[PDB]
Amino acid sequence: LSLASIHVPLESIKPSSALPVTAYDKNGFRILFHFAKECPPGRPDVLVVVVSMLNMAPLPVKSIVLQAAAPKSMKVKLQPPSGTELSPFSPIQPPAAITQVMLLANPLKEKVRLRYKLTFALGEQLSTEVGEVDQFPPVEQWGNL
């Protein structure tokens, strides 16, 4: 099982009819998982997720690094992010967002659980946030979400 040869272009991702799930939300910084409608070509086992990161707090956030871990029977891959910083929210302009394509291979069709480590900085001040998400679409519906 691998995901090495899989790269799903952001622009190519169609929306599913599912609601985004909250992976992390603290101090105006929320990360949601947007489940793609389709699977990569030839990969019915891969759930394509558009991870969004939004900053609604008055302070800017930089050095944003998201990492994930999946059950041994699965494989998780994170494509490069659209960026690593989020400007402070400003009523005058649309919120600053970062998107990161995450791929999850679940060949055996088991229940999905995803751990993550969020790392970022406010100025030089470091932050490390860890968590577990277990709100995913039924594996049976992957590919036609």
Binding site: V65, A68, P71, K72
Partner: peptide
Amino acid sequence: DFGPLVGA
């Protein structure tokens, strides 16, 4: 039983 942390 999880795998290791993975990053871009």
